[PDB]
Amino acid sequence: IVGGYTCGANTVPYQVSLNSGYHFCGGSLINSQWVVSAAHCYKSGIQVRLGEDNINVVEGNEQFISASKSIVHPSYNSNTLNNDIMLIKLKSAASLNSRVASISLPTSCASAGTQCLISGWGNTKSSGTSYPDVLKCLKAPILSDSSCKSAYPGQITSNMFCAGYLEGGKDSCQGDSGGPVVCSGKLQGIVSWGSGCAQKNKPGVYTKVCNYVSWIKQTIASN
Ligand SMILES: CC(=N)N1CCC(Oc2ccc([C@H](Cc3ccc4ccc(C(=N)N)cc4c3)C(=O)O)cc2)CC1
Numbered sequence: 001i002v003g004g005y006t007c008g009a010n011t012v013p014y015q016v017s018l019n020s021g022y023h024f025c026g027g028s029l030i031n032s033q034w035v036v037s038a039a040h041c042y043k044s045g046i047q048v049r050l051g052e053d054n055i056n057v058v059e060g061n062e063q064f065i066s067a068s069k070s071i072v073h074p075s076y077n078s079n080t081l082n083n084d085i086m087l088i089k090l091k092s093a094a095s096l097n098s099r100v101a102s103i104s105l106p107t108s109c110a111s112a113g114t115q116c117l118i119s120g121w122g123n124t125k126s127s128g129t130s131y132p133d134v135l136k137c138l139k140a141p142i143l144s145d146s147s148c149k150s151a152y153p154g155q156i157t158s159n160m161f162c163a164g165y166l167e168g169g170k171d172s173c174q175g176d177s178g179g180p181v182v183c184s185g186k187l188q189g190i191v192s193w194g195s196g197c198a199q200k201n202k203p204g205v206y207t208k209v210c211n212y213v214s215w216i217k218q219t220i221a222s223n
């Protein structure tokens, strides 16, 4: 997260860290046994780490659970990043409490202007690389479809939305991928892509979760 702030230990209880010997992607806990992330985060040998703040020190409250199966959306396209969504089933159900809790799926899509909270352990620099120990947060509004498509001509599908600041300086970045975009207590987006990080007129692009609620529910029910 570039231009964000330190969230505070366990203040984003649904935030998950995907680990394979190091943090590589974020995710959101949607129930005791399922996590939603980005399809481009797919990898074998994924350990889901819940209740994390400092990802390098064991501070208490952490729950490490192996992924039993990762389900990449069947229509995911790796070049366009359309349908960039993946469901991860935990080997065992997580112990939900004050510091580890699930986030609700939306019943309707969010409108332009809606303020949302984006979080992650991704790169904190626009020019260069600097990864944080603790979780970073950023409040950003959903932009209009017009501005989104003007920024990324011919690259925005109906399953994507832009969020952020056109003036640059505040944005999600590499490492934040798969993480949550929560608006009014509902998971509306998943960190997907963008051109660089926190660049002028190049806001972040996110997977539009409201378009996948039926798919998520049907898939979870059959697995
Ligand atoms: C051709 C086309 N339709 N598109 C859309 C999808 C695709 O977008 C992508 C896909 C991957 C990449 C990465 C780097 C990367 C990875 C994760 C990111 C997450 C968030 C942000 C952001 N600025 N909000 C930027 C990121 C930039 C890389 O360089 O490895 C960058 C753009 C290419 C451009």
Ligand SMILES: [Ca+2]
Pocket: 054, 055, 056, 057, 058, 059
């Ligand atoms: Ca740690």
